[PDB]
Design a protein around this nucleic acid. Sequence first.
RNA 1: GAGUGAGAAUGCAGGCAUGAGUAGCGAUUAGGCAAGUGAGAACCUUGCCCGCCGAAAGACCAAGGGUUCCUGGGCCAGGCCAGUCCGCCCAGGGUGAGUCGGGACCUAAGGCGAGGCCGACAGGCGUAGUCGAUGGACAACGGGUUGAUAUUCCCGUACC
Lengths: 54, 118, 97, 46, 114
Amino acid sequence: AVPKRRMSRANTRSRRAQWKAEAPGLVTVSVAGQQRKVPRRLLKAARLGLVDLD
Amino acid sequence: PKPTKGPRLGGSSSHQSALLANLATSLFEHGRIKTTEPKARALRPYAEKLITHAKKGALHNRREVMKKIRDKDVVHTLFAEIGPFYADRNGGYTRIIKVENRKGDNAPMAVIELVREK
Amino acid sequence: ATITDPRDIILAPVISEKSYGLIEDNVYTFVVHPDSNKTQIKIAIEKIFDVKVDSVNTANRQGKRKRTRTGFGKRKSTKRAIVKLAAGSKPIDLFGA
Amino acid sequence: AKGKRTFQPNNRRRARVHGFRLRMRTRAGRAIVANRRSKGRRALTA
Amino acid sequence: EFPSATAKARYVRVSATKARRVIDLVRGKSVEEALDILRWAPQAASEPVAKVIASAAANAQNNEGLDPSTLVVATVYADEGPTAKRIRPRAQGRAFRIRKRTSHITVIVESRPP
RNA sequence: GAGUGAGAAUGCAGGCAUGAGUAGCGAUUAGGCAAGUGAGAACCUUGCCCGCCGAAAGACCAAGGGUUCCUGGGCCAGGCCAGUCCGCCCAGGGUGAGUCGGGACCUAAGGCGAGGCCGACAGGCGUAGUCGAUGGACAACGGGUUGAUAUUCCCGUACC
Ligand SMILES: [Mg+2]
Ligand SMILES: [Mg+2]
Ligand SMILES: [Mg+2]
Ligand SMILES: [Mg+2]
Ligand SMILES: [Mg+2]
Ligand SMILES: [Mg+2]
Ligand SMILES: [Mg+2]
Ligand SMILES: [Mg+2]
Ligand SMILES: [Mg+2]
Ligand SMILES: [Mg+2]
Ligand SMILES: [Mg+2]
Ligand SMILES: [Mg+2]
Ligand SMILES: [Mg+2]
Ligand SMILES: [Mg+2]
Ligand SMILES: [Mg+2]
Ligand SMILES: [Mg+2]
Ligand SMILES: [Mg+2]
Ligand SMILES: [Mg+2]
Ligand SMILES: [Mg+2]
Ligand SMILES: [Mg+2]
Ligand SMILES: [Mg+2]
Ligand SMILES: [Mg+2]
Ligand SMILES: [Mg+2]
Ligand SMILES: [Mg+2]
Ligand SMILES: [Mg+2]
Ligand SMILES: [Mg+2]
Ligand SMILES: [Mg+2]
Ligand SMILES: [Mg+2]
Ligand SMILES: [Mg+2]
């Protein structure tokens, strides 16, 4: 099948506006004397020293 | 262990067999590797089965580990320095820690390594 | 008019790492006009440098084809000549290393 | 599984068949060369 | 009116709406949160936008001597630019075109006292 | 005085939209890990296993293309992705024969053709001849070389 008419400004932009991204929260951890930021997935790893952050 | 529920990781049974054997050998040879996070998840059972076999040193376990992972060097190091070193520890032989996502395709990588606390 | 002289042929010597790999082995490299011949170049080098040469090898290098916005560019075709002096071994000081 | 295409080049065919001399051998070819030269093509013959 | 500085990077090899996806996540935030979000958002467009934000912060700090802790992103937007034109062979020897898109990125930074 | 007024002729040329960030990313072989360079590494470099072809998916030639060969530099443009990589692009270098392939040797099918025949004309024929290999006569090996070239360069021994 094919479209037969041009879908309007409102329809196109309204459909497109739902596609976005979500900003996550950050976690401060005290390692090596510096407080650096990880997601909560890495809190234990950061405290023990098992995750590499550039 | 429980099989991977979905379509298999690498794309066929022989392929994942070879892949998992190579991952187990390289991980046991080195100590700390960085790989795809679901790959490490599926790696955990195999390395843990090897640790189970290693705990009880004998000829049958020699041959079992050989037929599993195909390297005299890695099986020797496994039976000589890894085996007795986990004598008093029951389960929990590997640690999974994920790291920054890959640049190539944004796949989540995890660093999987032996526990060296004891 | 014009008379026949042997050293109306040599264009230049060529300097390269291979040219030095040959200069160590008493074998030289020269740039020669296309319409020449090994006999003419032999007589020319003998007469000009007072050295008795054994044999001369010649090769043709087709011109390259270099990009340019104006259009399709082609350089000129050149002929290199490999010459080997005899066991007398008289270095040519005019080569300038 | 036939997929062999029409154009199978050979520079020897090309030159003996659409060559300047095959043009000049016949009067029609001379007429064609003259027409092309009047037009002002860069490459007179293949 | 408040002091402000601007910085842009044109001819960036990303799609307009695809960079705008990331750009919609930084409007109105402070520069520190902006840098954090761009670092932690896994998108290709996150790199050029973060570079533009970093450059704008550097310009504001150097040229006008402003304190970075109080800078916030005033307006950020991406506009489509010249599109590279290519051709792709498709089935049955019939040919379609490929529009290689390119986008502009504009960042202006405003210093708002707490 | 007019090439003088467009909204349409599945009009013409240029530009830009939606379908849309949707389908596809080019096979019957399959990778993973470590160390190294790099601002960035599944994709490049080096090491170990695994996988596939192996009358080929290996190694040479002819026809064909012409610098895609090697080295060094850089990665906006091209590679269906990033790419330090490339058959990308910039510069430099690289092809060595009395004996390997053609001409100075000769012919097949066939082409050209002095004179000549025929044809208003343009022309078409074919004799003497001259062209025309996919044919025939006539002269090599082992090893070594650097970062790329070897039956060509060097060593050793010969040929016609
Ligand atoms: Mg010669
Ligand atoms: Mg060019
Ligand atoms: Mg990123
Ligand atoms: Mg009119
Ligand atoms: Mg109009
Ligand atoms: Mg119209
Ligand atoms: Mg139509
Ligand atoms: Mg559309
Ligand atoms: Mg779909
Ligand atoms: Mg798809
Ligand atoms: Mg393909
Ligand atoms: Mg890598
Ligand atoms: Mg096979
Ligand atoms: Mg076969
Ligand atoms: Mg066979
Ligand atoms: Mg050929
Ligand atoms: Mg050729
Ligand atoms: Mg190359
Ligand atoms: Mg380079
Ligand atoms: Mg580039
Ligand atoms: Mg491109
Ligand atoms: Mg180049
Ligand atoms: Mg005739
Ligand atoms: Mg006549
Ligand atoms: Mg005849
Ligand atoms: Mg002939
Ligand atoms: Mg012949
Ligand atoms: Mg060769
Ligand atoms: Mg050879």
